[PDB]
Ligand binder design. Structure first.
Ligand SMILES: *[C@@H]1O[C@H](CO)[C@@H](O)[C@H](O)[C@H]1NC(C)=O
Ligand SMILES: N[C@@H]1[C@@H](O)[C@H](O)[C@H](O)[C@@H]1O
Ligand SMILES: [Zn+2]
Length: 1015
């Protein structure tokens, strides 16, 4: 295995180093506003060295943005595809590329057989070429790598089945900045080339000056370079026709033949396109070839890529004709006039890359190596696109919930083959497709119109229900005696109980387990653990009595704690935010111990009085002028007091101290150690009253954040043996710190209400001497070093926080893990901050045509890990990566892949079993089974199950590795006949494995295996 910590890769371009050196001056470069006046030697090309130009027609089709997926399909995309089919059929030299398989699959399945065959033909013959082949063109900032892979797999599996093709070139012209997670996944999925566009204008200038726009993009830790993927960065401001022919959009716009008037389009530079004729073609060709030759100066080979398209282009037949006929005339003239030394033609993306690599092999060019990322994007001036790291945070959180549900449903149901009547494959396909759709760069990003966000939400809700159905059918099958099992595939044997989605104070949707002597004495509950190691975790359920005790299925008592059910209310009479306790339901909490990739059953039983193994939390309400808080049968009376500082410790874990406002002020790791200052604070950013306004995309603050005025908030302290918490009702946020004996959990119920033009930030203030350095993750896959740059505006120093961030000095690290992607930064030494929600009255001039005024309450979840790191083996100061400790990684897993909880629906579960998976190997802590998916339906004689294995890299800090078992995924199901290593999409076999054993992967590596079973 490559060492990902101790060897700093030697690359030609390292983006953090580049950023440190660059001046980022925004000067007027002339017609190329963000560049310079490009000059070329006309003698560079001649009969023996011609410029080869590939004009690549395309149409950018957003799966939801200003209209829903279905609205766009009906109004635009179905016509684009139908007319592409006709025009490509009729014009054999015409070409077209297509990216979004969600639309293509929608279209294809509605075609008659004759048309399906015609479509297959234009694909087989290379006229229509799929690029990337994902369900969508995903966001790269907020998306989790597991869902980037999911959507890629969904689109490519469809393409392989119906089109018999698997793209090896990726096209990402629109995500708002670019992540190295993409080449990581693509290179492990058979790709050879990728194209990107939305990178900071200063980066395009810098790389263009050095002809470093094409590069071998490797991972930041990759010393050897095996992760490298050839990448083409487009050089100009947009992918539209005015910004793709060459540096001068006033000239290039004249070659967008849709802009002459009848289509309702024009050229903002005031010179319209002109129909190409024999009398003007020489002049028109001389203008166009000059643009091409200027663009070609920015690249190393004699092969030039000219995209020809824009949003929802190539709809009408008249549009196909106007572009095709005019370009054909230009090509005939240019290619016949030796003096140009150009050969121009319609091409596809693969054709471009093939020709570039032919030139490379001919010794014509050598390409630079590059590592790093391309955040945070700015398209112009100080307009940094860091707002979408937070926009519509309810749905960003929902994404992570559904991510987990999809994994759990696919894994739970993979253990068996299912009858078609069970509709398992149908429900899983629906859930995968809706989650995949949301990865779109206007879905998870929060940059779509309100009604489109509602569509995505409704789709995701249906997907959650689909996952629940599959999960609960699976649990019932896995834990019922086989000769008793008698499934009704429409029936709900269990309901899922989720304590953190939509969340307390968001939706009152959790079911109470109703027990009573005259109704039902006891209830079975089941926990699932999707991770491949034994896990203990506190779990909680609502019950109708405080007198409840827990047993395992060997009837062993389990220690439990009962607490009240507290809900916070904005009292519009008293103008306070305060908690109310239920007098009819209670929370019971206990530790569940669950096998790797397994299930464990427990029983909740009512009694008439306090059970031996159940304890009761105390509750203390801190506020002046208190009033009573009755709690029904709950056996401990609520206590009252004036606001005061408090301190809490659960088990042998950290001691946390809180301000009189209920906010953390210090953490003491052990009995002897210092009380380390760690202060939570809430602040607000506003919007500028002159110049550019923040909106869904852009964060344009009117200066540093100002503290939220807290008043005298009400603080609730619950103290228990197993779990304690401090909760406070702040303006716009019910903030909770929960302690279970290890790193605390933070929950924020964020309701920005009607606070217009406000962004609420949560900041941590510490003494850690972090300087200008901090670390943020990329897609939940890797941590990248960031350097705060005071030469850039505040909004440029904001980065995506898709799963965590940390600061550290020689001795101390503070890591904040997240259960939802949000934007954040470290704006001063010792600080971390993460945005909670933003409500913006104005549009930000990127075409969305609305502000962000559709906020809804969201429950954000976090873990906060303070650690000593002086003994850890860390990368050198020059290394661009950072790595989590074991505790921080486990804390992240606790947020993203918690135990699933099931409540048996009926009164009695006949044939119930106590456990599943007790014999499953408990793998080393850094290894995950990211995906387990049965790939075959029940009628296949050879069943196949696919696994994606990911090994992270955890810091060595002197905690001896304990004995763990080797995980061989190929032997998880019986009767294995074959084990193959595959691409991550499972679509290509790469290696037939000796002894049918799937080897574990190296740190930072991801591998896929398929096991075949003869049953
Ligand atoms: C799928 O593509 C391959 C190209 O190598 C071809 O051999 C195979 O016959 C194709 N399958 C079809 C056309 O059904
Ligand atoms: N190019 C446009 C982007 O700026 C929008 O967010 C939509 O994705 C649209 O495609
Ligand atoms: Zn788009």
């Amino acid at each position: 295995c490559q060492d990902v910590v101790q060897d700093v890769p030697n690359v030609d371009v390292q983006m953090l180093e580049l950023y440190d050196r660059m001046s980022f001056k925004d000067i007027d470069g002339g017609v190329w506003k963000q560049g310079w006046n490009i000059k070329y030697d006309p003698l560079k090309y001649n009969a023996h060295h011609k410029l080869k130009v590939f004009v690549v027609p395309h149409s950018h089709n957003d799966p939801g943005w200003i209209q829903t997926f279905e609205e766009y399909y009906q109004h635009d995309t179905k016509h684009i595809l139908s007319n592409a089919l006709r025009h490509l059929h009729d014009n054999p030299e015409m070409k077209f590329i297509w990216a979004e398989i969600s639309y293509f699959a929608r279209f294809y399945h509605d075609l008659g057989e004759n048309k399906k065959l015609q479509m297959k033909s234009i694909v087989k013959n290379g006229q229509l070429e799929f690029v990337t082949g994902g369900w969508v063109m995903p966001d790269e900032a907020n998306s989790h790598w597991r869902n980037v892979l999911l959507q890629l797999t969904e689109g490519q599996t469809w393409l392989k089945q119906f089109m018999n093709v698997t793209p090896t070139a990726s096209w990402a012209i629109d995500p708002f900045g670019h992540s190295p997670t993409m080449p990581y996944i693509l290179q492990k999925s058979g790709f050879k080339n990728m194209l990107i566009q939305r990178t900071h204008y200063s980066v395009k200038k810098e790389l263009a000056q050095q002809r470093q726009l094409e590069f071998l993009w490797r991972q930041i830790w990759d010393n050897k370079g095996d992760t490298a993927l050839f990448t083409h960065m487009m050089p100009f401001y947009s992918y539209d026709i005015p910004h793709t022919c060459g540096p001068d959009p006033k000239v290039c716009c004249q070659f967008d033949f849709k802009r002459m008037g009848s289509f309702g389009l024009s050229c903002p530079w005031k010179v319209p396109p002109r129909t190409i004729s024999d009398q003007n073609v020489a002049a028109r060709s001389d203008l166009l070839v000059d643009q091409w030759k200027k663009k070609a100066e920015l690249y190393r080979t004699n092969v030039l890529l000219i995209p020809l398209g824009d949003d929802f282009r190539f709809k009408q037949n008249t549009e196909w004709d106007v572009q095709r006929v005019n370009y054909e005339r230009l090509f005939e003239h240019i290619n016949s006039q030796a003096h140009f030394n150009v050969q121009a033609q319609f091409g596809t993306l693969q054709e471009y890359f093939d020709a570039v690599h032919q030139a490379e092999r001919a010794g014509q060019a050598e390409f630079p190596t590059l590592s790093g990322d391309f955040f945070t994007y700015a398209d112009r001036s100080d307009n940094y696109w860091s707002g979408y790291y937070t926009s519509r945070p309810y749905h960003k959180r929902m994404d992570r919930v559904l991510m987990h549900y999809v994994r759990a449903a696919e894994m739970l149901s993979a253990w068996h083959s299912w009858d078609g009547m069970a509709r398992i494959e149908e429900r899983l396909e629906q859930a995968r497709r809706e989650l995949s759709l949301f990865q779109h760069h206007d879905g998870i990003t929060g940059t779509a119109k309100t009604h489109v966000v509602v569509d995505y939400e409704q789709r995701m809700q249906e997907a959650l229900k689909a996952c629940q159905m599959v999960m609960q059918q699976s649990v019932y099958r896995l834990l019922t005696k086989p000769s008793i099992y008698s499934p009704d595939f429409s029936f709900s044997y269990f309901t899922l109980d989720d304590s953190r989605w939509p969340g307390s104070g968001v939706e009152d949707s959790r079911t109470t387990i109703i027990l009573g002597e005259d109704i039902l004495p006891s209830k079975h509950v089941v926990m699932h653990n999707t991770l491949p190691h034994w896990r203990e975790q506190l779990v909680d359920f609502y019950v109708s009595s405080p007198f409840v005790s827990v047993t395992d299925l060997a009837n062993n008592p389990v220690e439990a704690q009962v607490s009240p059910v507290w809900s916070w209310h904005h009292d519009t009479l008293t103008k306070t935010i305060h908690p109310q306790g239920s007098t009819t339901k209670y929370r019971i909490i206990f530790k569940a111990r669950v096998p790797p990739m397994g299930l464990a059953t427990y029983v909740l039983t009512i009694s008439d009085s306090k059970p031996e193994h159940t304890s009761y939390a105390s509750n203390l309400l801190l506020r002046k002028n208190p009033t009573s808080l009755p709690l029904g049968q709950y056996p401990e009376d609520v206590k009252f007091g004036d606001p005061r500082e408090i301190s809490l410790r659960v088990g042998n874990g950290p001691t946390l101290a809180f301000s009189e406002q209920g906010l953390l002020k210090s953490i003491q790791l052990t009995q002897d150690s210092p009380h380390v200052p760690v202060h939570f604070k809430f602040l607000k950013y506003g919007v500028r009253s002159h110049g550019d306004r923040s909106g869904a995309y852009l964060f344009l603050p009117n200066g540093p954040a100002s503290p939220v005025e807290l008043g005298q908030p009400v603080v609730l302290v619950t103290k228990g043996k197993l779990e304690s918490s401090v909760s406070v009702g702040l303006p716009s946020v019910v903030h909770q710190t929960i302690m279970r004996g290890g790193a605390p959990e933070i929950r924020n119920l964020v309701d920005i209400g009607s606070l217009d033009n406000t962004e609420i930030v949560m900041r941590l203030e510490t003494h850690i001497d972090s300087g200008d350095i901090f670390y943020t993750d990329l897609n939940g896959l890797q941590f990248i070093k960031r350097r705060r740059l005071d030469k850039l505006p505040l909004q440029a120093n904001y980065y995506p926080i898709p799963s965590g961030m940390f600061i550290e000095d020689a001795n101390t690290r503070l890591t904040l893990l997240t259960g939802q992607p949000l934007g954040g930064s470290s704006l001063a030494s010792g600080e971390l901050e993460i945005m909670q929600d933003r409500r913006l009255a104005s549009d930000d001039e990127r075409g969305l045509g609305q502000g962000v005024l559709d906020n809804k309450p969201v429950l954000h979840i976090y873990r906060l890990v303070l650690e000593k790191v002086n003994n850890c083996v860390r990368p050198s100061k020059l290394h661009p990566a950072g790595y989590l400790t074991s505790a921080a990684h486990k804390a992240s897993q606790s947020l993203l892949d918690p135990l699933d909880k099931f409540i048996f629906a009926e009164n009695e579960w006949i044939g119930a079993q106590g456990q599943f998976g007790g014999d499953h190997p408990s793998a080393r802590e850094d290894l995950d089974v990211s995906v387990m998916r049965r790939l075959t339906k029940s009628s296949a004689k050879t069943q196949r199950v696919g696994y994606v294995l990911h090994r992270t890299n955890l810091m060595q800090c002197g905690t001896p590795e304990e004995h763990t078992q080797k995980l061989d995924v190929c032997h998880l199901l019986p009767n294995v006949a074959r084990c193959e290593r595959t691409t991550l999409t499972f679509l290509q076999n790469l290696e037939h494995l000796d002894g049918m054993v799937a080897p574990e992967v190296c740190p930072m590596e991801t591998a896929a295996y398929v096991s075949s079973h003869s049953s």
